[PDB]
Short mmCIF file of C-alpha atoms in Angstrom, two decimals:
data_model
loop_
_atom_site.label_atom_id
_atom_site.label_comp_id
_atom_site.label_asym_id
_atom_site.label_seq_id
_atom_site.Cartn_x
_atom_site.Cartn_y
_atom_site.Cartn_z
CA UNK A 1485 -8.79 -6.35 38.48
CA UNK A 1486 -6.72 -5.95 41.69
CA UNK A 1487 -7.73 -9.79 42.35
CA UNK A 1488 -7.90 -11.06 38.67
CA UNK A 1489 -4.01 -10.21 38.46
CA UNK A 1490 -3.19 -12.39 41.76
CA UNK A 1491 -5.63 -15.22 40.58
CA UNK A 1492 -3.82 -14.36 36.67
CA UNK A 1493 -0.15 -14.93 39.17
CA UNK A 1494 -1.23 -18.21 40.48
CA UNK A 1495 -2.17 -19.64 37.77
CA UNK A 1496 1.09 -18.98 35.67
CA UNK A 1497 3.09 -20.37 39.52
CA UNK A 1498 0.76 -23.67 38.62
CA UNK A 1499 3.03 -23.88 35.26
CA UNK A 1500 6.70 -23.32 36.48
CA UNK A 1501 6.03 -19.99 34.63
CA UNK A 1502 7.62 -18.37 37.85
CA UNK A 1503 9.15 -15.25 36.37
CA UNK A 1504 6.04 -14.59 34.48
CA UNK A 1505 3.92 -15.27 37.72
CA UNK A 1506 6.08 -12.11 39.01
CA UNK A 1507 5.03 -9.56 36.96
CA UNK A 1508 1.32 -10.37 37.76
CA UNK A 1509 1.61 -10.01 41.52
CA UNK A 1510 3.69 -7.24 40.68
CA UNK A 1511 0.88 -5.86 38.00
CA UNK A 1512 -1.95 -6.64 41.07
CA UNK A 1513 0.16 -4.26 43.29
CA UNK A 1514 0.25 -1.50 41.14
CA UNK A 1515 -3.46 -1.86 41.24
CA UNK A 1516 -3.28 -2.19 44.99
CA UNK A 1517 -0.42 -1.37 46.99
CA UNK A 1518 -2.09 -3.08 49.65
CA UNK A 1519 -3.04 -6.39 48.68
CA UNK A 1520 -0.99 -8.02 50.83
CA UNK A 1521 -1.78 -11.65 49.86
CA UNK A 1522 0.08 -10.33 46.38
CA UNK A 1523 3.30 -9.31 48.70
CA UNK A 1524 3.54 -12.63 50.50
CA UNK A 1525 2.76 -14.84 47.01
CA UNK A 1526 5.55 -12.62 45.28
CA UNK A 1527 7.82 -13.41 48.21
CA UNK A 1528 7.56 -17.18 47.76
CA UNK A 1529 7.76 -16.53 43.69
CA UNK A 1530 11.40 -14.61 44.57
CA UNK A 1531 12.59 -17.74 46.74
CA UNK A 1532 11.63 -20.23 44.21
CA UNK A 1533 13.28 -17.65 41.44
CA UNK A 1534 16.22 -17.13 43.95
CA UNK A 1535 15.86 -13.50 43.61
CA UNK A 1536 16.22 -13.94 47.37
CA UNK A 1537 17.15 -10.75 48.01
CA UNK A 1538 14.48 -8.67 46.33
CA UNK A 1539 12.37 -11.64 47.91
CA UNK A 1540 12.90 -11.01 51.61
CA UNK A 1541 11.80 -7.46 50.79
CA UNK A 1542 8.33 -8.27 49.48
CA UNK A 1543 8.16 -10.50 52.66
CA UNK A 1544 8.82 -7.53 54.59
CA UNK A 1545 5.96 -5.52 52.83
CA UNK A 1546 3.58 -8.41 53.47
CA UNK A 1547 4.56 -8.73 57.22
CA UNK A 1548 3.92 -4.76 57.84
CA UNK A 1549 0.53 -5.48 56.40
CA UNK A 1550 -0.80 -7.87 57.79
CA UNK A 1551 1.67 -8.42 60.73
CA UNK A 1552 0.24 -11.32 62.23
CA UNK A 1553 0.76 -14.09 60.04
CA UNK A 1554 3.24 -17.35 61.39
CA UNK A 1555 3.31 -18.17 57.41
CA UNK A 1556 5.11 -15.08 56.80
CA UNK A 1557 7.24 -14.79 59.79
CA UNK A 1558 8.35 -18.46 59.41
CA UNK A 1559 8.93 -17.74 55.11
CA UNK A 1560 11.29 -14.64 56.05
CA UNK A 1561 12.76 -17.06 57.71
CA UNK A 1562 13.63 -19.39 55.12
CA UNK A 1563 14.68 -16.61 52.57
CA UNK A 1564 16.89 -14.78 55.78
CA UNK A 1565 18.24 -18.63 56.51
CA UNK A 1566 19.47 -18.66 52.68
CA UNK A 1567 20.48 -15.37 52.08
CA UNK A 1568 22.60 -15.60 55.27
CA UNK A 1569 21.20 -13.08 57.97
CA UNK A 1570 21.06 -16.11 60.30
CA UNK A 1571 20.74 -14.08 63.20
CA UNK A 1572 18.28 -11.56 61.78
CA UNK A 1573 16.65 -15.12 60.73
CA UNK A 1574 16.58 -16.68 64.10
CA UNK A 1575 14.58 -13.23 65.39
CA UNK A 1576 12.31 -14.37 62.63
CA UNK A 1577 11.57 -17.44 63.73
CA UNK A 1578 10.70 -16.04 67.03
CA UNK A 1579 8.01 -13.70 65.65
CA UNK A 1580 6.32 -16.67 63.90
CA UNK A 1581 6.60 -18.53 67.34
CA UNK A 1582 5.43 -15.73 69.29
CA UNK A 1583 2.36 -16.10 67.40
CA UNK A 1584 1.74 -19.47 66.84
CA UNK A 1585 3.73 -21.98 69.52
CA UNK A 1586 2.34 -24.98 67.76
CA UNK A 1587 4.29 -24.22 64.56
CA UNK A 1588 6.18 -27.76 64.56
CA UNK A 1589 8.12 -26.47 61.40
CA UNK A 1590 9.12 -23.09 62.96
CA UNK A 1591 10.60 -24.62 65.90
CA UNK A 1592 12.27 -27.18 64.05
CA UNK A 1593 13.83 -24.91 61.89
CA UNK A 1594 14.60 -22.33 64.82
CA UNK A 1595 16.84 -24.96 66.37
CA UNK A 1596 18.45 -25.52 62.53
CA UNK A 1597 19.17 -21.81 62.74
CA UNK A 1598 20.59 -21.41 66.33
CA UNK A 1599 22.81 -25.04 65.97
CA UNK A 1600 24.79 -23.12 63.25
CA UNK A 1601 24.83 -19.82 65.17
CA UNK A 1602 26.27 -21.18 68.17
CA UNK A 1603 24.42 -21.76 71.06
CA UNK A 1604 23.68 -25.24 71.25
CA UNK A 1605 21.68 -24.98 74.51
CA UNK A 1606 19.30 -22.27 73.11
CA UNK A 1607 18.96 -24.77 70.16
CA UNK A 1608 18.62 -27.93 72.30
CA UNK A 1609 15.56 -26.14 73.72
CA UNK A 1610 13.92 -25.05 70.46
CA UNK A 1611 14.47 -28.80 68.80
CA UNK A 1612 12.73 -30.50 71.94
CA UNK A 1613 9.77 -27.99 71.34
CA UNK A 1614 9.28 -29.12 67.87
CA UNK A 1615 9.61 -32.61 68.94
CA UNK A 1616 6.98 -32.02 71.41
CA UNK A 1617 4.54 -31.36 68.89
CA UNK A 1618 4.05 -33.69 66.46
CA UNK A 1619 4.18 -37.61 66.24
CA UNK B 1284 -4.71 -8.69 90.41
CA UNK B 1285 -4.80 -12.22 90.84
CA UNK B 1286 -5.90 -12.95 87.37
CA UNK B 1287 -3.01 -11.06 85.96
CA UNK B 1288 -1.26 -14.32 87.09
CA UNK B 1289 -3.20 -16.99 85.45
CA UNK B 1290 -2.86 -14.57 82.51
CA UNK B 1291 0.76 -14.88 81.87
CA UNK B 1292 1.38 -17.75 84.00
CA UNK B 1293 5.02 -16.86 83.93
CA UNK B 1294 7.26 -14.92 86.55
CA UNK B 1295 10.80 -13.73 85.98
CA UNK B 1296 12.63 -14.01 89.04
CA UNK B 1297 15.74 -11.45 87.76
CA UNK B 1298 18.87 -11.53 90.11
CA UNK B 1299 21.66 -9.71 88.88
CA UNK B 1300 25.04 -7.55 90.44
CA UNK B 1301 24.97 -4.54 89.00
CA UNK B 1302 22.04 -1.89 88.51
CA UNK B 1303 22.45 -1.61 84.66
CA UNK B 1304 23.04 -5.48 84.21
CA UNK B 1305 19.45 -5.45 86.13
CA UNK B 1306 17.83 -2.62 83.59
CA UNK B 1307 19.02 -4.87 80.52
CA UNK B 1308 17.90 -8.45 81.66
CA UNK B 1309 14.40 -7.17 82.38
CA UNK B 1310 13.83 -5.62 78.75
CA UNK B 1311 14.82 -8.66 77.27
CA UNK B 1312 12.58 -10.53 79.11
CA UNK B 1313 10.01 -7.99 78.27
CA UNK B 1314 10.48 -8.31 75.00
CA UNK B 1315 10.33 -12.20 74.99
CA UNK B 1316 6.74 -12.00 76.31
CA UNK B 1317 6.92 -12.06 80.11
CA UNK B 1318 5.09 -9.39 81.77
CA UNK B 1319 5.47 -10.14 85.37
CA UNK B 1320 8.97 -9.46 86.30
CA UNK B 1321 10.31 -10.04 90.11
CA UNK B 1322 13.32 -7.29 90.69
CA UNK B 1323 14.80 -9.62 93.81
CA UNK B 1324 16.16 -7.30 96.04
CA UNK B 1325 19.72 -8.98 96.72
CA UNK B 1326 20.48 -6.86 93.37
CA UNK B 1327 21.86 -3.79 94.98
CA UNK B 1328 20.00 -0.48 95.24
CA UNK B 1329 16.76 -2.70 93.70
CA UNK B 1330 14.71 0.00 95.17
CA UNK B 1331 15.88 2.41 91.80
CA UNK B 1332 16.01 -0.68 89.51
CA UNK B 1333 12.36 -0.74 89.96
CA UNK B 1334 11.53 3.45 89.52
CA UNK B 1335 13.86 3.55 86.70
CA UNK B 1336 11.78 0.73 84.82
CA UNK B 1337 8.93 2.28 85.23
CA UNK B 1338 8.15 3.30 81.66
CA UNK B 1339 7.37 -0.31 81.20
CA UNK B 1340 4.61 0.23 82.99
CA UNK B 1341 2.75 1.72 79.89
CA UNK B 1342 4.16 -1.17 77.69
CA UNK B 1343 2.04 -3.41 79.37
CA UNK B 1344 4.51 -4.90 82.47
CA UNK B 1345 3.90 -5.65 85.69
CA UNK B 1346 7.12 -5.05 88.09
CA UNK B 1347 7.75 -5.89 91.57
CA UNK B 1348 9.59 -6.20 93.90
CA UNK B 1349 11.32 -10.30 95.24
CA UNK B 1350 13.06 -12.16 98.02
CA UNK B 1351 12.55 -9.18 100.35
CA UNK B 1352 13.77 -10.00 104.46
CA UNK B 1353 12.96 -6.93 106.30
CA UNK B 1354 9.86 -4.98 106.40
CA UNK B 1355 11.98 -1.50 105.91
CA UNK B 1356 13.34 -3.44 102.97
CA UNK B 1357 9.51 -3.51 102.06
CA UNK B 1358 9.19 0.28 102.34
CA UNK B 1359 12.02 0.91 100.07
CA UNK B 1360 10.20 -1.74 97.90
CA UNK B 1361 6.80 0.29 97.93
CA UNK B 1362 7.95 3.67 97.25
CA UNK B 1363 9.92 2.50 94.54
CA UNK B 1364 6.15 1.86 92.50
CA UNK B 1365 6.54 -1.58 92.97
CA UNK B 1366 3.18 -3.78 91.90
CA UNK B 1367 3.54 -6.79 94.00
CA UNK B 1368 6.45 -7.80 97.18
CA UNK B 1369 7.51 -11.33 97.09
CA UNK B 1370 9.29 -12.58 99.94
CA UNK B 1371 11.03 -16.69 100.34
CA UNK B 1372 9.54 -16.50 103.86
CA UNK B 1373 6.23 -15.59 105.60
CA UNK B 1374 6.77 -12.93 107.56
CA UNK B 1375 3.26 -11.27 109.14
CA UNK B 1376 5.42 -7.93 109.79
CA UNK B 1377 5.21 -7.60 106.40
CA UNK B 1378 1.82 -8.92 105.08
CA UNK B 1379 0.24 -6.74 107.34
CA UNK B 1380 2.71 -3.51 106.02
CA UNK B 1381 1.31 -4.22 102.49
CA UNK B 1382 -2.36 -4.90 103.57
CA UNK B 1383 -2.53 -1.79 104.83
CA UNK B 1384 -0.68 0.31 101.88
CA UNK B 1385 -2.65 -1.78 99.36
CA UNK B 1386 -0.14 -3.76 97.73
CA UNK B 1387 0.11 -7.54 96.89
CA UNK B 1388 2.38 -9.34 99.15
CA UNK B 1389 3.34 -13.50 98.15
CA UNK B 1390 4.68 -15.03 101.04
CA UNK B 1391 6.97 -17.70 100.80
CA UNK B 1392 5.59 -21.31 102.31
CA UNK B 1393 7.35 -24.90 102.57
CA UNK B 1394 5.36 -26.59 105.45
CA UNK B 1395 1.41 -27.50 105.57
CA UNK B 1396 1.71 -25.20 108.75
CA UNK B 1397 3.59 -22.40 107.47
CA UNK B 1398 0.73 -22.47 104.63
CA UNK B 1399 -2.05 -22.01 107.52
CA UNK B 1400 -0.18 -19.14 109.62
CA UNK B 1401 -0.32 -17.46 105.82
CA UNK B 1402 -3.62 -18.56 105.34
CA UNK B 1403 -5.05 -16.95 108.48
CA UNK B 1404 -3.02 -13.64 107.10
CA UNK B 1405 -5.71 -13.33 104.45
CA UNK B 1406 -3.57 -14.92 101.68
CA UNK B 1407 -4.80 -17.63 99.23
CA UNK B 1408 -2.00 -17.32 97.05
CA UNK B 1409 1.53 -18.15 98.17
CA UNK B 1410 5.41 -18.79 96.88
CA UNK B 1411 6.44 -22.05 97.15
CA UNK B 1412 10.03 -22.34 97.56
CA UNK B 1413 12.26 -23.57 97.02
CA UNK B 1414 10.32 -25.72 94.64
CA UNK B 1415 12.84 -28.08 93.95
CA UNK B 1416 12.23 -30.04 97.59
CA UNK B 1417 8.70 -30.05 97.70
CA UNK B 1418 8.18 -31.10 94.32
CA UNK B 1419 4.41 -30.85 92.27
CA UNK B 1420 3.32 -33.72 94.67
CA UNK B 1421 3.06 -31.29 97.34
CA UNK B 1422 0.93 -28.50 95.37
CA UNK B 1423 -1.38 -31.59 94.12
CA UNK B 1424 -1.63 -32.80 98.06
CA UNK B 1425 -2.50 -29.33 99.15
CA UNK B 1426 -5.22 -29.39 97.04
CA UNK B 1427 -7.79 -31.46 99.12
CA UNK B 1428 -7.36 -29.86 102.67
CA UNK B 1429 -6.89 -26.63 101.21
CA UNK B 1430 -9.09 -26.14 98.20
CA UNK B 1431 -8.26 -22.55 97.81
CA UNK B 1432 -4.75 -22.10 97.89
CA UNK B 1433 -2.87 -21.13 94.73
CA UNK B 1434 0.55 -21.38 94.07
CA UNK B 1435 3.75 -19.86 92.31
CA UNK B 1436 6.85 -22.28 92.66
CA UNK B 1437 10.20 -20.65 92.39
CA UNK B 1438 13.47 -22.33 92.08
CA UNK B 1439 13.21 -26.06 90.45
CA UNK B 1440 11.01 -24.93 87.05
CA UNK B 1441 12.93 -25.52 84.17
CA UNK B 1442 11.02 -26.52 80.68
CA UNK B 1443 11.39 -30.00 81.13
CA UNK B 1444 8.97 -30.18 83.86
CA UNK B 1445 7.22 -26.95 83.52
CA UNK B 1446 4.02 -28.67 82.23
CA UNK B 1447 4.17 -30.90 85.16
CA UNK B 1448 3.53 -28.16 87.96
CA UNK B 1449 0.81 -26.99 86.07
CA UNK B 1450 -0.83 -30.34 85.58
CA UNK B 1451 -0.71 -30.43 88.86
CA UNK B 1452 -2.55 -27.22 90.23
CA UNK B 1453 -0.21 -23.99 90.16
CA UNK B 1454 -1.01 -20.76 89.54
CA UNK B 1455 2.23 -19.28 87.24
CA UNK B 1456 6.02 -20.34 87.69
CA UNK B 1457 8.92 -17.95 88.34
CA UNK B 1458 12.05 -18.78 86.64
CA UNK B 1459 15.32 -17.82 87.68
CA UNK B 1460 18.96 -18.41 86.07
CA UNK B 1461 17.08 -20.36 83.22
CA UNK B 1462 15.44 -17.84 81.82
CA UNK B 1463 17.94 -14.88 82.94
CA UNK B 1464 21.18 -16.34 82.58
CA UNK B 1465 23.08 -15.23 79.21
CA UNK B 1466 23.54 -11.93 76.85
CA UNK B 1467 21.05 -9.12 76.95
CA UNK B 1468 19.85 -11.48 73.59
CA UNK B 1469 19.81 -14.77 74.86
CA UNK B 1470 17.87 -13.51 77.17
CA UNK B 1471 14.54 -12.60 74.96
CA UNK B 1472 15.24 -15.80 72.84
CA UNK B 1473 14.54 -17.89 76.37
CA UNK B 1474 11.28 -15.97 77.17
CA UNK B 1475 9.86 -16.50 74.20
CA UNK B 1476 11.24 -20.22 74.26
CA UNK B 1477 9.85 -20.79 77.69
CA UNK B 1478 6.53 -18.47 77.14
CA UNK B 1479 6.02 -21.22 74.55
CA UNK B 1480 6.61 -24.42 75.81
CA UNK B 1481 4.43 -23.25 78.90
CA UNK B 1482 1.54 -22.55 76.21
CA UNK B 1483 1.49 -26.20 75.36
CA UNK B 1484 0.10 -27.93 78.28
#
């Protein structure tokens, strides 16, 4: 039941039915507070929703599960980006690169983050990286 | 230990002016990644720079001791609990002081014959400085007549080359100003922006 309510969440996301996907990741962690591919899903539900600040929090519950994941370093990092944390964004960013330096997209979008926060050399250095990468 | 440096591949070569400017810049880089961290010794009273980070010692870092002249600059350097000396010369005062208190010593080497006088020392892995002059060309000509010699450049690595002097035969790189210039922040953001780029080529 702990899975059926994830697979029951998906299913509704395939419809636009976003705010009813919610409540069955939401339903799947009362079941399991640990299932934390229904904390990372719920986080990308949120940001779609633009419940963006409830959604960095789910983020933040998937992350301390599993903490290893560049997909959910580099989606705090949109939601912190949007919500306006850029500098607790841009440490992010780095966590996702830390763990996976071919992330074309996290680089990219670490030098988005850093061009707006200031440093243009720190940024300079991050864009090249991403440019580095792919074709 | 050897290994340790074809593990992280990366050296921070941290030059500062005061002793708690020196205490900040190294747990930034720490924190962006880079485990080997040079304490040069123009920073003054290095010698407690290097016992007062030694609780990074259980986090997983390797500290030691750079750009050291004299060899009584060397015993301040060992007593301190440094884990390797790193000098910009060769000086066989020296390489036979740590020899014989068990410590890694990295001489520093420009010439073919400078490399053989620290060859016949025992050493088969050696600074090359300043980088910038010699250039990868001379790591990837050194690597015919003297199959065994592994290098760390210093000075002239900055990440728009830094997959070139590996391409060509080094060892690690140590870093200076571009990787410890900035705020206590900056700092970790270029560790983990150089420890990065360097695990690309």
């Amino acid at each position: 039941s702990a899975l059926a309510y994830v697979m029951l969440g998906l299913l509704l996301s395939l419809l636009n039915r976003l705010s009813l996907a919610a409540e069955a990741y939401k339903k799947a962690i009362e079941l399991d507070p640990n299932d934390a591919l229904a904390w990372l899903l719920l986080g990308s539900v949120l940001e779609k929703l633009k419940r963006l600040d409830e959604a960095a929090e789910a983020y933040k519950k998937a992350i301390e599960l599993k903490p290893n994941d560049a997909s959910a370093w580099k989606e705090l990092g949109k939601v912190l980006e949007k919500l306006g944390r850029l500098d607790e964004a841009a440490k992010a960013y780095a966590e996702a690169i830390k763990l996976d330096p071919s992330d074309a997209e996290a680089a990219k979008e670490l030098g988005k983050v850093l061009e707006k926060l200031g440093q243009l050399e720190l940024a300079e250095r991050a864009y090249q990286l991403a440019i580095e990468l792919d074709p | 230990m050897e290994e340790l440096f074809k593990k992280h591949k990366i050296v921070a070569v941290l030059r500062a002016n005061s002793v708690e400017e020196a205490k900040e810049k190294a747990l930034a880089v720490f924190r962006g990644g880079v485990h080997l961290i040079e304490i040069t010794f123009t920073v003054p009273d290095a010698d407690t720079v290097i016992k007062e980070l030694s609780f990074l010692k259980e986090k997983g870092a390797i500290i030691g001791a750079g750009t050291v002249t004299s060899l009584e600059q060397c015993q301040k350097a060992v007593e301190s609990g440094a884990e390797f000396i790193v000098s910009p010369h060769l000086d066989p005062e020296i390489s036979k002081f740590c020899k014989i208190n068990g410590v890694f010593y990295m001489p520093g080497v420009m010439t073919p014959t400078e490399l053989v006088k620290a060859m016949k020392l025992g050493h088969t892995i050696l600074k090359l400085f300043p980088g910038e002059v010699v250039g990868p060309q001379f790591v990837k000509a050194m690597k015919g007549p003297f199959p065994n010699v592994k290098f760390v450049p210093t000075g002239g690595v900055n990440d728009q080359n830094v997959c070139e002097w590996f391409k060509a035969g080094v060892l690690a790189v140590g870093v200076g100003s571009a990787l410890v210039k900035g705020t206590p922040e900056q700092v970790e953001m270029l560790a983990v922006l150089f420890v990065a780029k360097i695990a690309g080529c």
